[PDB]
Design a protein around this ligand. Structure first.
Ligand SMILES: CCCCCCCCCCCCCCCCCCCCCCCCCC(=O)N[C@@H](CO[C@H]1O[C@H](CO)[C@H](O)[C@H](O)[C@H]1O)[C@H](O)[C@H](O)CCCCCCCCCCCCCC
Ligand SMILES: *[C@@H]1O[C@H](CO)[C@@H](O[C@@H]2O[C@H](CO)[C@@H](O)[C@H](O)[C@H]2NC(C)=O)[C@H](O)[C@H]1NC(C)=O
Ligand SMILES: *[C@@H]1O[C@H](CO)[C@@H](O)[C@H](O)[C@H]1NC(C)=O
Ligand SMILES: *[C@@H]1O[C@H](CO)[C@@H](O)[C@H](O)[C@H]1NC(C)=O
Lengths: 239, 203, 272, 97
């Protein structure tokens, strides 16, 4: 029993229309929409007992639900408010008490999108001093000058994503802490064996997925549209 | 407000056991669920307690439920670094779909990894293209070492991050420092932090 | 003796609702529980039966939790069925157990939706009786998912009900076996047809409920006697009236004979 | 919706001057929301005692309304009942015979 949510990250503007979709191929009659906020548990917004049905939860105000089919249940934010910045969770279930939860959806509602930027990714090759001293090679990734802090950093070795020996910062640091709502910077480390890095056929790549503007979002500024894009940097092995 | 967890947050060392509490005023109390939520990730179900006096187990995780006392405990025997997550207590008021789920705020657990053989050093890593741009990496330091932020605004230092090389059962703490300034050098990078005397500094 | 817990729940709209219950042991009221009262009220001194003070609180708390739980379960079920079923909705429940000699019992739990008997608890689950609509197959599926309530209802019908009534019959043996003398009086009303007249024999204040009321010509019993329905009195006694369509002239030389357990051997005879 | 059946009768044998009790037994009605009034020569009696509402095996509801009264050859007694099943309130008078 798996539940999918689209998008996984969304950056919207105040007054704009936001739609958070949820799909379930488990043929469950009932589906539920929740929001998670720091200092609180999951609070029920809306729920549906079947297609056509839409019932108010504990905190429905500001949200509209839609159940067009058994498979899909959407949460609509007709006029987005900054108070709707939360992690939204979807769930589904049959006649039983078990509610099978989705992976979550992070939503950010900004007052304006004028200071939205994608990141500049750079991979730093391990030092020859480390290889000789520890017999290990640490690669360092660096994503810079991005707003907001809605990014997903991943390490890819020869077209296949790796997790062992990977460590990314829990929170990105502010590039200009003194400046109000400034750009962010996030770094990650990948450690491999000296003999693995020394192989010139191994292709190392740090991928940063940025979540920004959509095609429907209007852009009046002269610079290039800061759209939801993938920014990556590569590094080849050497002996 | 109806479901309350204690402690709010706690810090334990690797191998130590951690006991988490849950007290609820929910009426009726059909079942209790313990969820594990990684920072940013989703809700992973650990166990479900249904009886008046229940006791369940799943690997290192073990839980007890006393419906008369409206209290539940979660024991994590020999905690590992990957146990660092938020633990959520959930109470269901019905044995069917008619039920409402009453969630707790959550208990934040932080597990300090066990560094077997430390070797602190500050290495200079250079960019793939162009090599003029570089970063300073302070790695292989013990759990007692704290990385302090830079006093200089134009100098950026990240907080300690521990990676796990699962295949070789190796764990290492690491912090990265960088700046565009010419005055910036790895020997003077982590000067604001209390660093060990045996820290290796190459040429 | 038949013990029954009669519940009447009315749901006018999505917000307004009230549930009132009345409990009987034969033709005598034993309990009452209005929507206004937070606790079940006794109407007889022996209403607690042979249950201890601690045993009653544990039983009452189960009903207190049930009443709140039931109200929401119907409200959610209406949401689950919408727009198929909508308020006003009137749900009735008739749960109890009929007692037989030699420690023998038969327990029931019948549910009626809008005055029609549709659901019943049978064995280990909820079930739809014949004649009931098919839309109730989803609420029953949901009501059968809740194993916790199923184990509670099973225990309540199979064990708790016969054990309570056994003690209740022991405690209320004096009030159930009580005898009240009936007071009879004669009257006449001219019938719709020109010629005949209806002669009424008003019998009131008798207990227990079984009685024998008949019109006699002196010694020969009249076959044209129409005994009405049992009407209850405020002081837990019964009222009954038997009519006889007699032609104008046959009135004289006719009496009403009443035979009841309270009278003993001497029957009440009133000549016209 | 089923039309309610009203039955008005005296608890004790009626005797002019002696105080008796008048009973009003309303039956065969669904929904259970009703308005029972026991009247004396037209005006509603103030201390009308009501019994708890119940229902028979045919799921139809029933309730008994009673009050203390002193019958007279001039005084008239009635039971006015208003239910959803009837467009006009059903008023049945008390016939001593
Ligand atoms: C019954 C005779 C016993 C003898 C005792 C005599 C004492 C005299 C006092 C009597 C007082 C009069 C009161 C009126 C009595 C009416 C008879 C009905 C009794 C019903 C049995 C009570 C069920 C008890 C279980 C209950 O409260 N369930 C609860 C809570 O359950 C939760 O909490 C529990 C712990 O408290 C468990 O943890 C459980 O797993 C969880 O889900 C649960 O919510 C039940 O669903 C309650 C509803 C049941 C009625 C369903 C009727 C079907 C109607 C279908 C119509 C569909 C309409 C579609 C629009
Ligand atoms: C309560 O009594 C009923 C019988 O009226 C029991 O139901 C039977 O349960 C067994 C399994 O335990 C089934 O094989 C039968 O088919 C059931 N009978 C019917 C008519 O469905 C029930 O188990 C009893 N419950 C308790 C708790 O004793
Ligand atoms: C619900 O029903 C009650 C009783 O019939 C009525 O007084 C009330 O106004 C109704 N409420 C709504 C929201 O219609
Ligand atoms: C019935 O009782 C409950 C709890 O006492 C209350 O919330 C509800 O409003 C009551 N309904 C009526 C109509 O009295």
């Amino acid at each position: 029993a798996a539940v999918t949510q689209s998008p996984r990250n969304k950056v919207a503007v105040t007054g704009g229309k936001v739609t958070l979709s949820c799909n379930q191929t488990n043929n469950h009659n009932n589906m539920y929409w929740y929001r998670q906020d720091t200092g609180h548990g999951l609070r029920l917004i809306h729920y549906s007992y079947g297609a056509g049905s839409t019932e108010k939860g504990d905190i429905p105000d500001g949200y509209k639900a839609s159940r067009p089919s058994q498979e899909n249940f959407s949460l609509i934010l007709e006029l987005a408010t900054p108070s709707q910045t939360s992690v939204y969770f979807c769930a589904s279930g049959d006649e039983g008490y078990t509610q099978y939860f989705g992976p979550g959806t992070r939503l950010l509602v900004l007052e304006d999108l004028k200071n939205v930027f994608p990141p500049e990714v750079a991979v730093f090759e391990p030092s020859e001093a480390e290889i000789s001293h520890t017999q290990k090679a640490t690669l360092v990734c660096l994503a810079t000058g991005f707003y907001p802090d809605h990014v997903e950093l991943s390490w890819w070795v020869n077209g296949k994503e790796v997790h062992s020996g990977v460590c990314t910062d829990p929170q990105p640091l502010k590039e200009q802490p003194a400046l109000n709502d400034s750009r962010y910077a996030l770094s990650s480390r990948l450690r491999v064996s000296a003999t693995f890095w020394q192989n010139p056929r191994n292709h190392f790549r740090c991928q940063v997925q940025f979540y920004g503007l959509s095609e429907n979002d209007e852009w009046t500024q002269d610079r290039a549209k800061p759209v939801t894009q993938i920014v990556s940097a590569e590094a080849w092995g050497r002996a | 407000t109806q479901v309350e967890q204690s402690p709010q947050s706690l810090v334990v060392r690797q191998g130590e056991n951690s006991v988490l509490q849950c007290n609820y005023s929910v009426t009726p109390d059909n079942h209790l669920r313990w969820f594990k939520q990684d920072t940013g990730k989703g809700l992973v179900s650990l166990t479900v307690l249904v009886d008046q006096k229940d006791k369940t187990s799943n690997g290192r995780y073990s839980a007890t439920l006393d419906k008369d006392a409206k209290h539940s405990t979660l024991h994590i025997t020999a905690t590992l670094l990957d146990d660092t997550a938020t633990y959520i207590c959930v109470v269901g008021d019905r044995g069917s779909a008619l039920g409402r789920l009453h969630f707790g705020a959550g208990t934040q657990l932080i597990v300090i990894p066990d560094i077997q053989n430390p070797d602190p050093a500050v290495y200079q890593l250079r960019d793939s293209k162009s090599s003029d741009k570089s970063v300073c990496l302070f790695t292989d330091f013990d759990s007692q070492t704290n990385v302090s932020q830079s006093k200089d605004s134009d100098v950026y230092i990240t907080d300690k991050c521990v990676l796990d090389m699962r295949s070789m059962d190796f764990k290492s703490n690491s912090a990265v420092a960088w700046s565009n300034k010419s005055d910036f050098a790895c020997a003077n990078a982590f000067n604001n932090s209390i660093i060990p005397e045996d820290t290796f500094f190459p040429s | 003796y038949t013990f029954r817990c009669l519940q009447m729940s009315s749901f006018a709209n999505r917000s307004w609702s009230r549930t009132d219950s009345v409990v009987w042991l034969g033709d005598l009221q034993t309990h009452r529980w209005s929507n206004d009262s937070a606790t079940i009220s006794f109407t007889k001194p022996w209403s607690q039966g042979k249950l201890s003070n601690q045993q009653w609180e544990k039983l009452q708390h189960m009903f207190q939790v049930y009443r709140v739980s039931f109200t929401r379960d119907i409200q959610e079920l209406v949401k689950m069925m919408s727009p198929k079923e909508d308020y006003p909705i009137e749900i009735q429940l008739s749960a109890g157990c009929e007692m037989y000699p030699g420690n023998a019992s038969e327990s029931f739990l019948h549910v009626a939706f809008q005055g029609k008997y549709v659901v019943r608890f049978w064995g280990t689950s909820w079930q739809t009786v014949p004649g009931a609509p098919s839309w109730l197959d989803l609420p029953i599926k949901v009501l059968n998912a809740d194993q916790g309530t199923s184990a509670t209802v099973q225990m309540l019908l199979n064990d708790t009900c016969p054990l309570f009534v056994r003690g209740l019959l022991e405690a209320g043996k004096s009030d159930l076996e009580k005898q009240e003398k009936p007071v009879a009086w004669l009257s006449s009303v001219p019938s719709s047809a020109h010629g005949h007249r209806q002669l009424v024999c008003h019998v009131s204040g008798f207990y227990p409920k079984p009685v024998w009321v008949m019109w006699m010509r002196g010694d020969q019993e009249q076959q044209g006697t129409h005994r009405g329905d049992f009407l209850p009195n405020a002081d837990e006694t019964w009222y009954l009236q038997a009519t006889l369509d007699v032609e104008a002239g046959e009135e004289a030389g006719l009496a009403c004979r009443v035979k009841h357990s309270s009278l003993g051997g001497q029957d009440i005879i009133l000549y016209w | 919706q089923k039309t309610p059946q009203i039955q008005v009768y005296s608890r004790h044998p009626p005797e002019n001057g002696k105080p008796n009790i008048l009973n009003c037994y309303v039956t065969q009605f669904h929904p259970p929301h009703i308005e029972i009034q026991m009247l004396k020569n037209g005006k509603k009696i103030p201390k009308v005692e009501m019994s708890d509402m119940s229902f028979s095996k045919d799921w139809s509801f029933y309730i008994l309304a009673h009050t203390e009264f002193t019958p007279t050859e001039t005084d008239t007694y009635a039971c006015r009942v208003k239910h959803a099943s009837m467009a006009e309130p059903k008023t049945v008078y008390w016939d001593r015979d």
